[PDB]
From Swiss-Prot, chain A:
InterPro entries: AIMP3/p18_C, Arc1-like_N, EEF1E1, Glutathione-S-Trfase_C-like, Glutathione-S-Trfase_C_sf. It comes from Homo sapiens. The modification N6-acetyllysine is found at K139. Residues 3-57 are annotated as: N-terminal. This is Eukaryotic translation elongation factor 1 epsilon-1. Residues 58-64 are annotated as: Linker. Induction: By DNA damaging agents such as UV, adriamycin, actinomycin-D and cisplatin.
Curated annotation (Swiss-Prot), chain B:
It is found in: Cytoplasm, Cytosol; Nucleus, Nucleolus. GO terms for biological process: cellular response to epidermal growth factor stimulus; cellular response to platelet-derived growth factor stimulus; methionyl-tRNA aminoacylation; positive regulation of transcription of nucleolar large rRNA by RNA polymerase I; rRNA transcription; tRNA aminoacylation for protein translation. The gene is MARS1. Belongs to the class-I aminoacyl-tRNA synthetase family. The chain holds residues 1 to 211 of 900 of the full protein. GO terms for molecular function: ATP binding; methionine-tRNA ligase activity; tRNA binding. This is Methionine--tRNA ligase, cytoplasmic. Changing E86R: Loss of interaction with EEF1E1.
Length: 168, 211
């Protein structure tokens, strides 16, 4: 996976934060830590991410209803427990299959609104999707469509490699 | 809405405790299903608890389900609560899973069980102690308390695994357990059987790392 500090720099930019925060790392898993303004500590990738979203005044990215907020947090958790818990190509195929089924009738993770869940799942899946064969990208067509859409969403991709899709 | 639970699945503890928060906002139907039953259409492998929302979407994460119930009651997201829920997911659950493995699958006792969670328990105790409030983030129990109580209950319901030097933890845990929704949840999930009820679920789990 991307180092959390690298991911948080990406997110900051996507958000439009000026800014540059300094993140320390805690424990053996190098969990990111943010010295807040001001000034208790905030610890954990998705925790800090939701704080930056508020800081940027783009809280709609966290969901606009009770249901959407719950769904956003479910996919953020999924990102830090399921996606970051695998490597290479094995396990990942069950995951992709499930994600593929879920996205059959959805543009974004929550439905029709783009959220922080889409950003972080895209950052988290990039290392796997970039290694997919043409065959696999056709097998997981709904994942491909969602990923292709996010990677062109304004200011989200940055320096990350574009993945070739056809259409579709 | 319909909430799907199963006997002896520990994840059903916090959701059952949280479900009352939906009162006056929506109706939660409770449905008991089998361990290998697949309720979520997009998930290959059986998963419980699951909440089928009135919109037809599914929540398959226990913490997200508890969050949704609290949000319906008017609760508002805060950083401290997110911090606790992320820690519960990524640091406590595997520590707890390992301890419960050694305890209910491999029949160990004492520090062979406690060893894998003492660090986590101590962290909770020290958080409660440095705060002057009785609950994790607030004057009254809230989302973080229910989620953490739900994860801890299958182990800490046995006093052998709640070290008394961790006095803040002990007080907090005992207080939550005696609240009515927590009492009802423990009865429904464990019935009367204590921790043994969990055995079948714990068998299927991956094994832990090292000592």
């Amino acid at each position: 996976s991307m180092a959390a500090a690298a991911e948080l720099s990406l997110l900051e930019k996507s958000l439009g934060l000026s800014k540059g925060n300094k993140y320390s790392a805690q424990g053996e898993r190098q969990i990111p830590v943010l010295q807040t303004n001001d000034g208790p500590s905030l610890t954990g990738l998705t925790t800090i991410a939701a704080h930056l979203v508020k800081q940027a005044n783009k809280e709609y990215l966290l969901g606009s209803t009770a249901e959407e907020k719950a769904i956003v947090q479910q996919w953020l958790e999924y990102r830090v427990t399921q996606v970051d818990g695998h490597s290479s190509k094995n396990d990942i195929h069950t995951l992709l299959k499930d994600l593929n089924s879920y996205l059959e009738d959805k543009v974004y993770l929550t439905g029709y609104n783009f959220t922080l869940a889409d950003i972080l799942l895209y950052y988290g899946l990039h290392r796997f999707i970039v290694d997919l064969t043409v065959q696999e990208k056709e097998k997981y067509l709904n994942v491909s469509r969602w990923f292709s859409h996010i990677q062109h969403y304004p200011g989200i991709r940055q320096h990350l490699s574009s993945v070739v899709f056809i259409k579709n | 809405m319909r909430l799907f639970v199963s006997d002896g699945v520990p994840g059903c503890l916090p959701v059952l405790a949280a479900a009352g928060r939906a009162r006056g906002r929506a109706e939660v139907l409770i449905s008991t299903v089998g361990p290998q039953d697949c309720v979520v259409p997009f998930l290959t492998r059986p998963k419980v608890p699951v909440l089928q929302l009135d919109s037809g979407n599914y929540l398959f994460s226990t913490s997200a389900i508890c969050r949704y119930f609290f949000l319906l009651s008017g609760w508002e997201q805060d950083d401290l609560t997110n911090q606790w829920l992320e820690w519960e997911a990524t640091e406590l659950q595997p520590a707890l899973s390992a301890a419960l493995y050694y305890l209910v699958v491999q029949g160990k006792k004492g520090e062979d069980v406690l060893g894998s969670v003492r660090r986590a328990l101590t962290h909770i105790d020290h958080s409660l102690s440095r705060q002057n409030c009785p609950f994790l983030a607030g004057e009254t129990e809230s989302l973080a308390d229910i989620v953490l109580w739900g994860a801890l209950y299958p182990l800490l319901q046995d006093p052998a695994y709640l070290p008394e030097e961790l006095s803040a933890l002990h007080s907090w845990f005992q207080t939550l357990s005696t609240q009515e929704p927590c009492q009802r949840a423990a009865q429904t999930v464990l019935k009367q059987q204590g921790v043994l009820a969990l055995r079948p679920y714990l068998q299927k789990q991956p094994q832990p790392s090292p000592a």
